[PDB]
Amino acid sequence: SIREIGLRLMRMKNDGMSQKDIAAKEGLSQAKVTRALQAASAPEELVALFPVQSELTFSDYKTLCAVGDEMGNKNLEFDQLIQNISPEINDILSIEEMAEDEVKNKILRLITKEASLLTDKSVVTELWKFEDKDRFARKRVKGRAFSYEFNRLSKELQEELDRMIGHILRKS
Amino acid sequence: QTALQHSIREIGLRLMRMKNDGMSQKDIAAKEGLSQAKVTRALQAASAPEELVALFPVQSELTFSDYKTLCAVGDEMGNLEFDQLIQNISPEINDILSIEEMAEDEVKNKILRLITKEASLLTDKKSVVTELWKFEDKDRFARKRVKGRAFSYEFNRLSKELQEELDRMIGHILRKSLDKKPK
DNA sequence: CGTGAAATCGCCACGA
DNA sequence: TCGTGGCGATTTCACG
DNA sequence: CGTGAAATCGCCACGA
DNA sequence: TCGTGGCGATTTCACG
């Protein structure tokens, strides 16, 4: 709600209009001006996540701005987050019982979750999914170094997997 | 009535009887009239592990030199330990009594060479780094590491071409694992 | 300085 | 024996 | 609780 | 801008 009104007032920030005039070019209160503008800066990628953007509280957009800064504010890191929970987002959007306001709530608290542990490095990439608890394949990137890590897979696989990488290097 | 030997090992026993009555071996080397050295060498063998003493057919073809390397093996392993070991080898041990031609000559050198071997693989029981392409750079590298039933490939500072290459290639390989049909 | 849920280890056991 | 699932015991790890 | 060599990390700089 | 060797600055690691 306040969001749209925000992105709408935003364009008139770049039109060369000062909050003042706008608060008047809309019959709105200057305070509500900064409110809206502020809510309009929140990280879109997350904005989108929410299925019923109408139930978002100004506090929500605000907390979102926070989950953003504390996280730097750049795309890829978001996308990193977006996926680390993407399945639960769709998971919840499957439940039927809980109201729509309870959904966003659950969803929000979720966005503050990742934000805290992923900003406390551990950039991984579950390159496979077994139904087994222990058993895995993953890639890990950190600064100027990457590494793959598998566990509990066929010795042949290991074999196969050794043989190859040895080459790609040899191809240098 | 029974007494006096030369299977060197027996002498021990007696001297062991005596050593127990609080008698310096130095005394013994005189009481009985032998060289302190040997009196220890004696005793030394008299302590060779009874069990391991067994596995041998002709304990008479056992050389001191071995006997040492035996009690050596006696304790060198906590001194359940003896039993399990008698096992792991029991086959290949007996699997040698068969072999037609060969008496107390190369029985030892194999029975031994085994008992010890399959008795060393016990006392001592982690990651295992390895290199792939030792570079020239300071900290640029490509290694494999195996801390268990889990392996992994480590890499530092490399051409984004290299990554993708693997990235896609690893996925290539992985994917190969499985395709279901029909209808 | 406990806590429980999630990733892991440890060890048993059955088929090449 | 050696390799690989399974399943319970234990370590990790973010909270309260 | 040092103490140095080697393994890593900071960051500044150079060519599509 | 971004992706890549370089070398100083520092953290790792096994001992004495």
Residues 80-99 of A with CB under 7 A from strand C: none
Cβ atoms < 10 Å from Cβ of A84: 16
Q: Which long-range contacts (CB under 8 A, 24 or more apart) does A34-40 make?
A: A35/A2, A36/A2, A36/A3, A36/A5, A36/A6, A36/A9, A37/A6, A37/A9, A37/A10, A37/A13, A38/A6, A38/A62, A38/A65, A39/A2, A39/A3, A39/A6, A39/A65, A40/A3, A40/A6, A40/A7, A40/A9, A40/A10
CA A92, CA A110: separation in Å to the nearest integer?
11
**Distance, angstroms, CA A84 to C1' C8?**
21
Rounded to 10 degrees, the C-alpha dihedral B102/B105/B108/B113 comes to -80
Max alpha carbon distance in chain A (Å)? 73
Experimental method of this PDB entry: X-ray
* CB-CB contact of A149 with A158 (8 Å): no
Q: Among residues 60-79 of chain A, which lie with CB inside 8 Å of chain B? A: none
The spacing between the Cα labelled CA in B72 and the C1' in E3, in angstroms, equals 39
Question: Distance from A170 to chain B by nearest Cα, in Å?
Answer: 8
Contact partners, residue B62, CB within 8 Å, separation at least 6: B9, B56, B108
Please give the Cα distance from B159 to A112 (Å, whole number).
35
Q: Cα separation of A52 and B72, whole Å?
A: 78
Using the structure block, give the residue that is written with the tokens 């006997």.
B67
Interface A-B: count of C-beta contacts within 8 A: 67
* Any strand C atom closer than 7 Å to A151 CB: yes
CA angle A83, A68, A103 (to 5 degrees): 60
d(CA A60, CA B41): 87
Q: Is any Cβ of chain A less than 8 angstroms from the Cβ of B165?
A: yes
**Residue spans of alpha helices (H) in chain B:** 8-20, 25-28, 36-46, 50-54, 64-75, 81-94, 108-115, 120-123, 160-176
State the Cα–Cα distance between residues A44 and A64, nearest whole angstrom.
10
In chain B, DSSP finds a helix count (H) and a strand count (E) of 9, 3
Q: Which ranges of B106-159 does DSSP label H, i.e. alpha helix?
A: 108-115, 120-123
Contact of A51 with A101, CB cutoff 8 Å: no
Which residues of chain A come before a gap where C and the next N are over 2.5 Å apart? 120
The DSSP code for B137 is S
CB contact under 8 A, A145 and B151: no
**DSSP run (H or E) holding A58:** helix A58-69
Question: Which one-letter amino acid corresponds to residue A138?
Answer: R
Interchain contact, B169 vs A168, CB within 8 Å: yes
Whole-angstrom distance, CA of residue B68 vs CA of residue B53:
12
From residue A77, give the alpha-carbon distance in Å to each of A57, A62, A83, A88, A141. Answer: 24, 19, 10, 18, 13
Contact B154 A164 (CB under 8 A): no
Q: Which of residues 125-154 of A touch strand E (CB under 7 A)?
A: 143-145
Q: Is B73 exposed, middle or buried (0-12, 13-18, 19+ CB in 10 A)?
A: buried
Q: Which residues, listed in sequence order, are joined to residue B142 by a DSSP beta bridge?
A: B155
Instruction: Indicate the SS3 state at residue B63.
Output: coil
